[PDB]
Amino acid sequence: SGTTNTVAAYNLTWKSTNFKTILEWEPKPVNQVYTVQISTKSGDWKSKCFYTTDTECDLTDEIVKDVKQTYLARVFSYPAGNVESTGSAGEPLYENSPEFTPYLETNLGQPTIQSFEQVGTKVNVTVEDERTLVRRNNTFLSLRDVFGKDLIYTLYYWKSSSSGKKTAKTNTNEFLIDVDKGENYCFSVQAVIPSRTVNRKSTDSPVECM
Amino acid sequence: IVGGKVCPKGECPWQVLLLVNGAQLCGGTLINTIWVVSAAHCFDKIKNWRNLIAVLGEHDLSEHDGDEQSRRVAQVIIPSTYVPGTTNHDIALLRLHQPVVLTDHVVPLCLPERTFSERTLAFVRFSLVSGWGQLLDRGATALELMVLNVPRLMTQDCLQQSRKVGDSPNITEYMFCAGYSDGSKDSCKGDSGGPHATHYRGTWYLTGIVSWGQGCATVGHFGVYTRVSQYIEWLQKLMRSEPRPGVLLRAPFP
Amino acid sequence: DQCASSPCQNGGSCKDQLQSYICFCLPAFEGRNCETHKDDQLICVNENGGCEQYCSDHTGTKRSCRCHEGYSLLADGVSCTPTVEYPCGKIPILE
Ligand SMILES: *C[C@@](*)(O)[C@H](CCCNC(N)=[NH2+])NC(=O)[C@H](Cc1ccccc1)NC(=O)[C@H](N)Cc1ccccc1
Ligand SMILES: *[C@@H]1O[C@H](CO)[C@@H](O)[C@H](O)[C@H]1NC(C)=O
Ligand SMILES: *[C@H]1O[C@H](CO)[C@@H](O)[C@H](O)[C@H]1O
Ligand SMILES: *[C@H]1O[C@@H](C)[C@@H](O)[C@@H](O)[C@@H]1O
Ligand SMILES: [Ca+2]
């Protein structure tokens, strides 16, 4: 704040799923516009979302350029009257966001069971290689393409009427739990990055039984 | 220039060396063949406004190759609002008795359009500071031109990160911070008046002038640089304005 | 579901999530709804307006580029070339 008319943005938080990264913030603009600026520890700052009355800003295109780097972002405030007001130190009022490293923080969207079939006395559960916003050379990249070998999975399965909760994992992309010869089984999957220290596990993929 | 690197002879062409009777006074910058820009405070004492010498092409004060060019400083102009002994409005526009010769070793730095300085240059992370100042605090001064590549901060961050001092002069809108607060590197005592040249797309512009700092590369502190862009119309007003009697003119400001 | 109302504008796909969506945009679009035109943004505050040196915004008309006191504006409308031997801000040896 440090206000008299122009209020400072606050609560800057990153909303990122499958690298689709959107910075959001407070407060709902009142007689003032915001401009988002982003950079890397040692890079120049790039401005985004010019003079907007929004409380969000999409930064996908900048972050996927190198989801390995750590990005710091900051929002500027300007009275709607003029988009160039001299603060006190002569510069605009702005606030900094928390640091953001796509690779380690963007949560993995809810997985989706691609196509599971029967190979015999067991079930071959499969998960669709999710599509990310990490646009690489005109094309996009699948989670497996991005995290390569850092992405594993978990398979929670209930049986006909069930009685217990079972789990199975495979770093590949194909589960393979051994089932009996009757009792139908259900499959609830969830992408996981065990080497993570925050959003390690995702959300339980919608269920698909028999 | 604490923690720098010797500026390869020729790569700091706008670097001016301001001498007095033969002793180093400060550094300065060539924004034009007869116009040097330095730090106001560098003249708080100057008693012989005649031995005031400006040296370009300079590089190694030890040996004397043939690329140097001396020039008696004709006039020394500082802002009307500068108050000797204080931190604000620390900038000076020097005029040489006679223009220097442009050569591969003597080229001026561009004095950017204010707008440009404000919208673009200001957000280019790094810029080079340079001079023959001290290499450590009470340490010795450089014999070979030293240059440092430092990062700029907006005053809010500068305040948020520096250790609050007893009476740390406010970081007014005529100065900006650049450097590191981890004791690493920074400009120092003999550098005042030196350029803080920013590179933008193949061209270098004068965005800062060495002024003050707590010590030199003191932990939890940055180095304050005079925000050259508050002073552009000012500089260009003077450069056209016809000469004035005295040596130490005190041009009005704004 | 979610991608029902098809929030993703300007041709962007829509890989929604539970209680939310995710717009995949076309190279010239960005935003939660691919709403933003990577084009409609040619202003000096943006990226020096695309100019190599100086930039001037204009009322209801394309921004203009200009060059420094010793340069000249190339044919592309955004580039500057030296019109003199030793132009400011250029390091002769390296050059
Ligand atoms: C004249 C210049 O050579 C020299 C440059 C020092 C640059 N140092 C860093 N760390 N960037 N400047 C000084 O010697 C100034 C002179 C001065 C100017 C205005 C008011 C008082 C003195 N002195 C200092 O920089 C000293 N550290 C003193 C000081 C001044 C203000 C705050 C803290 C210390
Ligand atoms: C220093 O900063 C304070 C804080 O706003 C301001 O009131 C004052 O005018 C500035 N100059 C002085 C008195 O040091
Ligand atoms: C349709 O999709 C959802 C509805 O919940 C919303 O986000 C969009 O704004 C709407 O067009
Ligand atoms: C997502 O994939 C298909 C639907 C293409 O039309 C793309 O342009 C779209 O963004
Ligand atoms: Ca020499």
XYZ file of C-alpha atoms and ligand atoms in Angstrom:
629
model
C 0.000 0.000 0.000
C 1.985 3.005 1.257
C -1.180 4.570 -0.170
C -2.977 7.934 -0.437
C -4.721 6.842 -3.630
C -2.596 4.076 -5.214
C -2.646 0.800 -3.294
C 0.096 -1.808 -3.528
C -0.674 -5.292 -4.767
C -0.506 -7.999 -2.148
C -0.945 -11.733 -1.699
C 0.756 -12.357 -5.003
C 0.407 -16.119 -5.490
C 1.292 -18.410 -8.397
C -1.468 -20.607 -9.835
C 0.288 -23.220 -11.932
C -0.918 -26.541 -13.347
C 0.808 -28.420 -16.144
C 2.993 -25.336 -16.421
C 0.023 -23.198 -17.352
C 1.164 -20.498 -14.941
C -1.024 -17.620 -13.845
C -0.014 -15.100 -11.223
C -3.001 -13.887 -9.217
C -3.272 -11.117 -6.618
C -5.187 -8.569 -4.557
C -6.978 -6.240 -4.522
C -9.794 -5.880 -7.041
C -8.585 -2.688 -8.816
C -10.266 0.559 -7.735
C -9.233 3.692 -9.675
C -5.928 2.046 -10.542
C -4.385 -0.348 -13.021
C -1.695 -2.988 -12.694
C 1.264 -4.033 -14.811
C 3.047 -7.299 -14.208
C 6.779 -7.621 -14.657
C 8.753 -10.866 -14.632
C 12.406 -11.880 -14.661
C 15.025 -14.399 -13.651
C 17.544 -13.952 -10.856
C 20.040 -12.460 -13.333
C 17.943 -11.563 -16.353
C 16.316 -8.364 -17.541
C 12.687 -7.757 -16.512
C 9.955 -8.283 -19.084
C 6.628 -6.522 -18.603
C 3.328 -8.348 -19.095
C -0.391 -7.631 -18.634
C -0.031 -3.902 -19.396
C -2.230 -1.459 -17.467
C -4.854 -4.057 -16.556
C -7.660 -3.817 -13.994
C -7.301 -7.488 -13.301
C -6.067 -9.391 -10.339
C -4.379 -12.088 -12.408
C -1.778 -12.311 -15.179
C -0.864 -15.213 -17.393
C 2.895 -15.788 -17.480
C 2.946 -19.194 -19.205
C 4.901 -18.068 -22.274
C 7.710 -16.707 -20.139
C 7.979 -19.550 -17.657
C 7.913 -22.476 -20.088
C 10.827 -20.882 -21.939
C 12.945 -22.567 -19.242
C 10.889 -24.320 -16.549
C 14.267 -25.086 -14.963
C 15.000 -21.486 -14.004
C 13.610 -19.808 -10.922
C 11.406 -16.838 -11.739
C 10.628 -13.858 -9.569
C 7.680 -11.668 -10.546
C 6.285 -8.339 -9.374
C 3.130 -6.303 -9.910
C 3.092 -2.496 -10.327
C 0.261 -0.059 -9.386
C -0.821 3.130 -11.197
C -3.748 5.457 -10.570
C -6.065 4.952 -13.553
C -5.626 8.656 -14.283
C -2.061 8.250 -15.552
C -0.124 5.057 -16.210
C 3.067 6.847 -15.199
C 2.941 8.225 -11.663
C 6.058 9.193 -9.734
C 6.015 7.242 -6.495
C 8.277 8.778 -3.869
C 11.658 7.277 -4.701
C 10.509 8.319 -8.148
C 9.516 4.799 -9.170
C 6.150 2.979 -9.367
C 4.652 1.168 -6.435
C 4.939 -2.585 -6.876
C 5.101 -5.764 -4.838
C 7.119 -8.960 -5.290
C 5.727 -12.443 -5.728
C 7.249 -15.513 -4.196
C 10.028 -17.109 -6.259
C 8.770 -19.644 -8.794
C 10.457 -22.635 -10.406
C 7.966 -24.324 -12.754
C 9.700 -27.708 -12.824
C 9.427 -28.172 -9.065
C 6.139 -26.428 -8.274
C 3.555 -26.440 -11.046
C 1.144 -29.145 -9.905
C 0.505 -32.101 -12.182
C -3.052 -31.912 -13.443
C -5.492 -34.702 -12.663
C -4.263 -37.726 -14.633
C -6.571 -39.655 -16.933
C -6.612 -43.423 -17.543
C -5.718 -43.602 -21.255
C -6.794 -47.168 -22.134
C -6.715 -50.215 -19.846
C -7.342 -53.750 -21.133
C -6.884 -57.405 -20.184
C -3.732 -59.411 -20.875
C -5.044 -62.384 -18.938
C -5.219 -63.065 -15.206
C -4.315 -59.435 -14.498
C -5.254 -55.911 -15.584
C -3.117 -53.530 -17.645
C -4.152 -50.084 -16.390
C -2.871 -47.221 -18.549
C -2.653 -43.437 -18.121
C -2.858 -40.826 -20.877
C 0.399 -38.919 -21.361
C -0.926 -35.546 -20.187
C -0.426 -32.492 -22.422
C 1.509 -29.529 -20.910
C 1.741 -25.848 -21.832
C 5.517 -26.185 -22.032
C 5.513 -25.263 -25.714
C 8.788 -26.549 -27.176
C 9.535 -25.633 -30.794
C 5.972 -24.994 -32.064
C 4.916 -28.254 -30.396
C 3.868 -29.024 -26.819
C 5.398 -31.568 -24.417
C 3.841 -34.416 -22.445
C 4.577 -34.785 -18.734
C 6.770 -37.730 -19.623
C 8.622 -35.507 -22.115
C 9.117 -32.820 -19.470
C 9.857 -34.664 -16.220
C 11.266 -37.527 -18.266
C 12.137 -40.098 -15.629
C 11.088 -38.017 -12.599
C 7.422 -38.970 -12.995
C 6.011 -42.139 -11.444
C 2.424 -43.067 -10.566
C 0.062 -44.677 -8.059
C -2.870 -47.025 -8.656
C -5.555 -47.265 -5.975
C -7.978 -50.107 -6.677
C -11.229 -51.250 -5.064
C -12.839 -54.604 -5.990
C -16.489 -55.601 -6.538
C -18.062 -54.333 -3.284
C -14.415 -54.213 -2.187
C -13.172 -54.543 1.381
C -9.691 -53.070 1.268
C -7.717 -50.299 -0.418
C -4.906 -51.454 -2.713
C -2.035 -49.458 -4.254
C 0.447 -50.088 -7.098
C 3.180 -48.029 -8.789
C 5.269 -47.955 -11.961
C 7.643 -45.296 -13.275
C 6.790 -46.460 -16.789
C 3.262 -45.516 -17.857
C 1.576 -48.911 -17.530
C 0.275 -50.398 -14.282
C -0.119 -54.171 -13.998
C -1.758 -55.514 -10.847
C -2.594 -59.203 -10.705
C -6.336 -59.714 -10.282
C -8.270 -62.897 -9.493
C -10.559 -64.282 -12.227
C -13.855 -62.551 -11.550
C -14.592 -59.752 -9.079
C -14.500 -56.491 -11.039
C -11.828 -53.958 -10.100
C -11.670 -50.150 -10.142
C -8.730 -47.872 -10.909
C -7.985 -44.495 -9.322
C -4.647 -43.096 -10.524
C -2.584 -40.055 -9.547
C 0.614 -38.666 -11.075
C 3.550 -38.376 -8.666
C 6.981 -36.750 -8.538
C 8.614 -38.361 -5.453
C 11.769 -36.281 -5.865
C 9.616 -33.227 -5.177
C 9.435 -31.297 -1.937
C 6.010 -29.677 -2.311
C 3.390 -30.787 -4.840
C 4.719 -34.338 -4.951
C 1.376 -36.065 -5.527
C -1.485 -34.846 -7.764
C -5.210 -35.644 -7.731
C -6.904 -39.018 -7.974
C -7.705 -39.522 -11.668
C -11.419 -40.166 -12.213
C -12.218 -43.835 -11.585
C -12.686 -46.527 -14.263
C -13.848 -50.029 -13.252
C -15.579 -52.762 -15.294
C 36.326 -1.018 -8.014
C 35.986 -3.777 -5.382
C 35.874 -7.255 -6.883
C 36.183 -6.090 -10.469
C 38.356 -7.004 -13.415
C 40.878 -4.907 -15.333
C 39.005 -3.212 -18.198
C 40.795 -4.385 -21.377
C 42.425 -1.241 -22.774
C 39.912 0.170 -25.244
C 36.778 -1.361 -23.764
C 36.105 1.556 -21.407
C 36.622 4.381 -23.968
C 34.325 6.829 -22.221
C 36.278 6.493 -19.002
C 37.712 9.824 -17.977
C 40.378 10.278 -15.327
C 40.087 13.567 -13.457
C 43.467 14.792 -12.200
C 44.403 17.706 -9.936
C 47.987 18.993 -9.914
C 48.879 15.412 -10.743
C 46.896 13.579 -8.083
C 43.870 11.406 -8.863
C 40.673 13.313 -8.044
C 37.954 11.056 -9.374
C 36.715 9.475 -12.560
C 34.291 10.934 -15.092
C 32.467 10.176 -18.316
C 32.758 11.365 -21.895
C 29.302 12.125 -23.256
C 30.839 14.367 -25.906
C 34.165 15.666 -27.202
C 34.277 18.591 -24.780
C 31.794 17.467 -22.194
C 32.694 15.242 -19.275
C 30.215 14.113 -16.618
C 31.370 13.494 -13.096
C 30.172 13.477 -9.501
C 29.414 16.829 -7.860
C 30.994 15.932 -4.505
C 34.353 15.440 -6.287
C 34.884 19.164 -6.067
C 33.934 19.962 -2.487
C 37.585 20.951 -1.934
C 39.242 21.835 -5.267
C 41.197 25.008 -4.479
C 43.170 25.427 -7.723
C 40.493 25.393 -10.450
C 43.424 25.579 -12.860
C 45.327 22.352 -12.210
C 42.057 20.557 -12.923
C 43.002 18.060 -15.680
C 40.832 15.567 -17.573
C 42.519 12.508 -19.123
C 41.049 10.259 -21.802
C 42.482 7.219 -23.514
C 44.018 6.647 -20.087
C 44.260 3.027 -18.974
C 47.457 2.172 -17.106
C 48.620 5.009 -14.872
C 51.978 3.261 -14.393
C 53.260 3.240 -17.953
C 52.526 5.905 -20.533
C 51.584 4.528 -23.993
C 50.515 7.116 -26.526
C 46.722 6.925 -26.363
C 46.150 9.403 -23.538
C 44.872 12.924 -24.198
C 44.934 15.632 -21.526
C 42.628 18.663 -21.345
C 42.365 21.472 -18.818
C 38.854 21.436 -17.430
C 37.421 24.766 -18.582
C 34.240 24.877 -16.525
C 32.811 22.783 -13.695
C 29.027 22.865 -13.387
C 26.961 21.339 -10.581
C 23.209 21.525 -9.850
C 21.870 24.505 -7.946
C 20.292 22.094 -5.478
C 23.535 20.254 -4.745
C 24.654 20.851 -1.177
C 28.400 20.108 -0.757
C 28.913 17.469 1.898
C 25.538 15.770 1.343
C 24.353 12.871 -0.846
C 21.713 14.529 -3.002
C 22.190 15.874 -6.533
C 25.660 14.384 -6.866
C 26.453 15.194 -10.486
C 28.724 17.546 -12.405
C 29.052 18.594 -16.033
C 32.652 19.377 -16.951
C 33.755 21.339 -20.000
C 37.202 21.043 -21.505
C 39.332 23.937 -22.616
C 39.637 22.094 -25.937
C 37.854 19.060 -27.429
C 39.467 15.625 -27.321
C 40.100 13.620 -30.476
C 37.782 10.663 -31.076
C 39.797 7.504 -31.707
C 39.531 3.782 -31.078
C 40.534 4.684 -27.513
C 38.386 7.744 -26.947
C 34.688 7.539 -27.683
C 31.757 9.173 -25.869
C 28.967 7.291 -24.072
C 25.411 8.056 -25.139
C 23.238 10.183 -22.877
C 19.935 8.270 -23.424
C 16.499 9.801 -23.908
C 14.907 10.165 -20.494
C 11.933 8.067 -21.488
C 14.248 5.341 -22.772
C 16.348 5.522 -19.628
C 13.156 5.082 -17.562
C 11.100 2.539 -19.508
C 13.922 0.371 -20.868
C 17.457 0.843 -19.536
C 16.226 0.842 -15.937
C 15.124 -2.785 -16.302
C 18.318 -4.223 -17.773
C 19.604 -6.230 -14.823
C 23.308 -5.457 -15.276
C 25.553 -2.464 -16.048
C 29.305 -1.854 -15.781
C 30.774 0.532 -13.253
C 34.454 1.434 -13.596
C 37.324 3.592 -12.395
C 40.822 3.603 -10.830
C 39.369 3.941 -7.331
C 40.096 1.761 -4.300
C 40.263 -2.025 -4.728
C 39.099 -2.614 -1.152
C 38.137 -0.076 1.510
C 41.170 1.673 3.010
C 43.017 -0.364 0.347
C 45.186 0.773 -2.532
C 43.854 2.306 -5.731
C 44.042 0.685 -9.161
C 46.859 1.364 -11.594
C 44.939 -0.304 -14.464
C 41.342 0.722 -15.205
C 39.031 -1.656 -13.262
C 35.440 -2.419 -14.356
C 32.578 -4.128 -12.494
C 29.319 -5.593 -13.759
C 26.610 -4.994 -11.153
C 22.829 -5.534 -10.811
C 20.325 -2.721 -10.287
C 17.457 -2.627 -7.788
C 14.423 -0.416 -7.440
C 14.555 1.737 -4.299
C 11.904 -0.364 -2.516
C 14.077 -3.476 -2.679
C 17.189 -1.443 -1.857
C 15.523 -0.311 1.371
C 14.112 -3.705 2.173
C 17.520 -5.341 1.899
C 20.014 -2.916 3.344
C 20.825 -2.962 7.041
C 19.134 0.107 8.463
C 21.941 2.487 9.427
C 21.823 5.201 12.078
C 21.382 8.031 9.575
C 21.583 6.286 6.199
C 20.807 9.165 3.773
C 17.432 8.502 2.139
C 17.596 6.893 -1.308
C 16.021 9.885 -3.077
C 14.686 9.804 -6.643
C 18.049 11.084 -7.920
C 19.971 8.008 -6.919
C 19.534 4.263 -7.318
C 21.188 1.192 -5.816
C 23.223 -1.398 -7.677
C 25.599 -4.072 -6.534
C 25.568 -6.867 -4.030
C 24.891 -6.820 -0.311
C 26.963 -9.934 0.323
C 30.320 -8.137 0.698
C 31.208 -9.450 -2.781
C 31.801 -6.518 -5.169
C 31.040 -2.777 -5.557
C 32.583 0.542 -6.661
C 34.645 2.515 -4.112
C 36.442 5.747 -3.016
C 38.356 6.777 -6.109
C 35.516 5.909 -8.462
C 33.131 8.782 -7.864
C 32.123 10.406 -11.105
C 32.570 7.141 -12.969
C 30.068 5.753 -15.466
C 27.397 3.135 -14.783
C 26.984 2.197 -18.423
C 24.047 0.053 -19.419
C 24.074 -2.051 -22.548
C 20.968 -2.209 -24.671
C 20.972 -3.814 -28.104
C 24.491 -3.036 -29.256
C 24.758 0.406 -27.706
C 25.806 1.706 -24.290
C 24.072 4.503 -22.408
C 24.987 6.500 -19.282
C 22.373 5.523 -16.670
C 24.441 6.056 -13.532
C 27.311 7.962 -11.918
C 29.228 6.647 -8.892
C 28.343 8.709 -5.774
C 28.326 7.053 -2.367
C 27.819 3.884 -0.316
C 28.352 2.941 3.356
C 31.769 1.466 2.867
C 32.961 -0.473 -0.141
C 31.207 -3.790 -0.676
C 30.021 -3.720 2.920
C 27.753 -6.635 3.831
C 24.042 -5.807 3.801
C 24.655 -2.644 1.842
C 24.594 -1.568 -1.742
C 26.226 1.215 -3.642
C 24.145 4.255 -4.461
C 24.432 5.661 -7.991
C 23.179 9.004 -9.236
C 20.117 8.322 -11.407
C 21.483 10.162 -14.502
C 18.014 10.302 -16.124
C 16.556 12.809 -13.697
C 19.245 15.021 -15.067
C 18.946 14.718 -18.835
C 17.140 17.865 -19.945
C 19.416 19.574 -17.439
C 22.638 18.309 -19.072
C 21.449 19.038 -22.592
C 20.296 22.503 -21.580
C 23.785 23.305 -20.372
C 25.564 21.736 -23.303
C 23.797 24.197 -25.631
C 23.853 27.144 -23.218
C 26.700 29.527 -24.043
C 29.782 29.605 -21.753
C 29.707 31.360 -18.390
C 32.326 33.495 -16.559
C 33.555 31.457 -13.625
C 34.936 27.958 -13.428
C 32.491 26.612 -10.877
C 29.105 27.520 -12.315
C 26.073 26.453 -10.313
C 23.436 25.770 -12.943
C 19.821 25.818 -11.638
C 17.766 22.648 -11.265
C 15.304 21.568 -12.481
C -16.887 -31.041 -16.739
C -16.017 -27.374 -17.274
C -14.856 -26.633 -20.853
C -18.564 -26.575 -21.669
C -19.007 -22.848 -22.290
C -15.756 -23.160 -24.235
C -13.933 -20.331 -22.381
C -10.774 -20.728 -24.491
C -11.115 -17.981 -27.067
C -9.214 -17.352 -30.303
C -9.099 -21.026 -31.275
C -7.323 -22.240 -28.168
C -8.072 -25.826 -27.117
C -9.415 -26.611 -23.622
C -8.112 -29.466 -21.398
C -10.315 -28.705 -18.373
C -9.929 -30.115 -14.886
C -12.326 -30.939 -12.069
C -13.838 -27.671 -10.840
C -11.669 -25.817 -13.383
C -10.146 -25.700 -16.898
C -6.857 -25.130 -18.779
C -6.698 -23.256 -22.076
C -4.022 -24.283 -24.561
C -3.252 -21.278 -26.735
C -2.129 -20.582 -30.250
C 1.388 -19.088 -30.638
C -0.092 -15.579 -30.951
C -2.327 -15.883 -27.912
C -1.947 -16.124 -24.186
C -4.054 -15.905 -21.075
C -6.364 -18.045 -18.987
C -8.785 -17.868 -21.939
C -6.154 -17.286 -24.657
C -7.954 -13.959 -24.660
C -4.762 -11.851 -24.967
C -3.566 -10.978 -28.488
C 0.225 -11.304 -28.434
C -0.042 -8.597 -31.099
C -2.210 -5.751 -29.741
C 0.583 -4.593 -27.419
C 2.924 -2.511 -29.580
C 3.716 0.113 -26.968
C 7.080 1.549 -25.812
C 6.553 0.402 -22.212
C 6.216 -3.140 -23.603
C 9.582 -4.135 -25.029
C 11.014 -0.753 -25.985
C 8.260 -0.942 -28.566
C 10.478 -3.198 -30.609
C 12.824 -0.325 -31.378
C 16.611 -0.688 -31.256
C 16.960 2.660 -29.559
C 14.264 5.314 -28.995
C 10.514 4.830 -28.928
C 7.464 7.096 -29.059
C 3.880 5.969 -28.509
C 1.239 7.811 -30.531
C -2.465 8.487 -30.238
C -4.513 6.000 -32.265
C -1.518 5.213 -34.515
C 1.411 2.772 -34.652
C 4.276 3.594 -32.292
C 7.354 5.225 -33.825
C 11.036 4.392 -33.478
C 13.886 6.883 -33.531
C 17.673 6.795 -33.314
C 20.250 8.575 -31.213
C 21.908 11.905 -32.008
C 24.468 10.262 -34.300
C 22.571 7.406 -35.926
C 20.047 6.793 -38.672
C 16.870 4.694 -38.762
C 17.242 1.753 -41.139
C 14.517 0.775 -43.600
C 12.725 -1.638 -41.241
C 11.514 1.230 -39.058
C 13.068 -0.093 -35.868
C 16.816 -0.348 -36.543
C 19.627 2.173 -36.114
C 22.900 2.476 -38.021
C 25.940 4.674 -37.382
C 26.133 7.674 -39.700
C 29.545 8.638 -38.363
C 32.942 7.139 -37.620
C 32.911 6.994 -33.800
C 29.234 7.056 -32.682
C 28.602 7.165 -28.912
C 28.131 3.924 -27.035
C 30.081 1.848 -29.546
C 33.350 0.182 -28.567
C 35.689 0.571 -31.597
C 38.130 -2.241 -30.747
C 35.431 -4.875 -30.270
C 33.492 -3.546 -33.260
C 33.779 10.900 -4.181
C 33.698 9.417 -4.581
O 34.805 9.066 -4.977
C 33.306 8.408 -3.508
C 32.759 7.125 -4.149
C 32.462 6.019 -3.153
C 31.628 4.893 -3.754
N 31.431 3.839 -2.757
C 30.509 2.882 -2.822
N 30.437 1.967 -1.861
N 29.667 2.833 -3.848
N 32.310 8.953 -2.611
C 32.651 9.344 -1.397
O 33.806 9.279 -0.986
C 31.537 9.888 -0.521
C 31.658 11.414 -0.412
C 30.465 12.074 0.218
C 29.382 12.463 -0.558
C 28.250 13.018 0.032
C 28.199 13.187 1.413
C 29.277 12.805 2.197
C 30.403 12.254 1.598
N 31.681 9.273 0.789
C 31.251 8.040 1.035
O 30.689 7.345 0.194
C 31.490 7.524 2.442
N 31.135 6.091 2.602
C 30.711 8.384 3.433
C 29.243 8.084 3.485
C 28.316 8.983 2.959
C 26.939 8.729 3.048
C 26.486 7.561 3.670
C 27.403 6.656 4.193
C 28.775 6.922 4.098
C 14.314 11.800 4.111
O 13.222 10.875 3.989
C 12.089 11.254 4.807
C 11.084 10.112 4.750
O 10.007 10.402 3.870
C 11.523 12.602 4.334
O 10.460 13.002 5.191
C 12.625 13.673 4.347
O 12.138 14.863 3.741
C 13.883 13.191 3.604
N 14.957 14.152 3.786
C 15.527 14.312 4.978
C 14.879 15.299 5.936
O 16.542 13.703 5.321
C -17.986 -21.494 -19.028
O -17.005 -22.285 -18.338
C -16.882 -21.946 -16.937
C -18.220 -22.216 -16.266
O -18.044 -22.605 -14.910
C -16.406 -20.500 -16.770
O -15.084 -20.502 -16.255
C -16.430 -19.733 -18.091
O -16.327 -18.343 -17.825
C -17.713 -19.995 -18.868
O -17.611 -19.390 -20.149
C -5.676 -27.312 -29.146
O -5.595 -28.455 -30.023
C -6.421 -28.354 -31.217
C -7.878 -28.258 -30.782
C -5.942 -27.195 -32.109
O -7.061 -26.536 -32.686
C -5.129 -26.192 -31.300
O -5.100 -24.948 -31.974
C -5.773 -26.010 -29.938
O -5.117 -24.973 -29.236
Ca 48.751 5.683 -19.542
